[PDB]
C-alpha cells in the first residue's frame, strides 16, 4: 500500500484505488496502473522532473529502503492478476530488487524528488509506475 500527495492530488496504484478515490476521480489509466483523485488538504511531496536512472525505493515487505538502478519508462508485458488481464503496462521502469505484491504504493525517489510508485515485481525484479511525465500534478 501507499500513495503520493502533491498539491490537491493523491496518486495511487489504480488496482488499489478506494471508493473515495473513484468518487473524486481526476484521471486514471489502466495501461499505467495509475489513478489520481482530489483531496481536501495540501500535498507536500515534490515530483522529480528528470531522466534519473538511480534512486531509493521503500520496500514494506522488508521495512527498509533500497538503492536501485532502474530502466527508462517503457511498455512491458505483465501477467493476468484479478485486477487486469495479460497486457503491456506502459511507463513502467524495472530494477533488480526485492518486492512482494503488498509492496505496491512504495515510493521511488531520486535527489530531485518522487519518481514513481511500486506497481509490479517478481523473480528478483521490482517495477515502478513512472509519474515524472505528469506535469499537470504541479499546476
Ligand atoms: N501492475 C499490475 O498489473 C500488478 C497488479 C497486482 C498484481 N501484480 C503483480 O505484479 C504482483 C506482484 C508479485 C510479486 C511482487 C510484486 C510487487 N508488486 N506487485 C507484485 C501485477
Ligand atoms: Zn532525478
Swiss-Prot record:
Residues annotated as the enzyme's active site: 15 (for protease 2a activity), 33 (for protease 2a activity), 104 (for protease 2a activity)
Disulfide bonds listed in the record: none
Name of this chain's protein: Protease 2A
Biological function: Cysteine protease that cleaves viral polyprotein and specific host proteins. It is responsible for the autocatalytic cleavage between the P1 and P2 regions, which is the first cleavage occurring in the polyprotein. Also cleaves the host translation initiation factor EIF4G1, in order to shut down the capped cellular mRNA translation. Inhibits the host nucleus-cytoplasm protein and RNA trafficking by cleaving host members of the nuclear pores. Counteracts stress granule formation probably by antagonizing its assembly or promoting its dissassembly.
Organism whose genome encodes this protein: Coxsackievirus A16 (strain G-10)
Reaction(s) catalysed by this chain's protein: Selective cleavage of Tyr-|-Gly bond in the picornavirus polyprotein
Subunit structure: Homodimer.
Binding site for Zn(2+) 1: 50, 52, 110, 112
Amino acid at each position: 500500500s501507499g500513495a503520493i500527495y502533491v498539491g490537491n492530488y493523491r496518486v495511487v496504484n489504480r488496482h488499489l484505488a478506494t471508493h473515495n478515490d473513484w468518487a473524486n476521480l481526476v484521471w486514471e489509466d489502466s495501461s499505467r496502473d495509475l489513478l489520481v483523485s482530489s483531496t481536501t488538504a495540501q500535498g507536500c511531496d515534490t515530483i522529480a522532473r528528470c531522466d534519473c536512472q538511480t534512486g531509493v525505493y521503500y520496500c514494506s515487505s522488508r521495512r527498509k529502503h533500497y538503492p536501485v538502478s532502474f530502466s527508462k519508462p517503457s511498455l512491458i508485458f505483465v501477467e493476468a492478476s484479478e485486477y487486469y488481464p495479460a497486457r503491456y503496462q506502459s511507463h513502467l521502469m524495472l530494477a533488480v530488487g526485492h518486492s512482494e505484491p503488498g509492496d505496491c504504493g512504495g515510493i521511488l525517489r531520486c535527489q530531485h524528488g518522487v519518481v514513481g510508485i511500486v506497481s509490479t515485481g517478481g523473480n528478483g525484479l521490482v517495477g515502478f509506475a513512472d509519474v515524472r511525465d505528469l506535469l499537470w500534478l504541479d499546476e
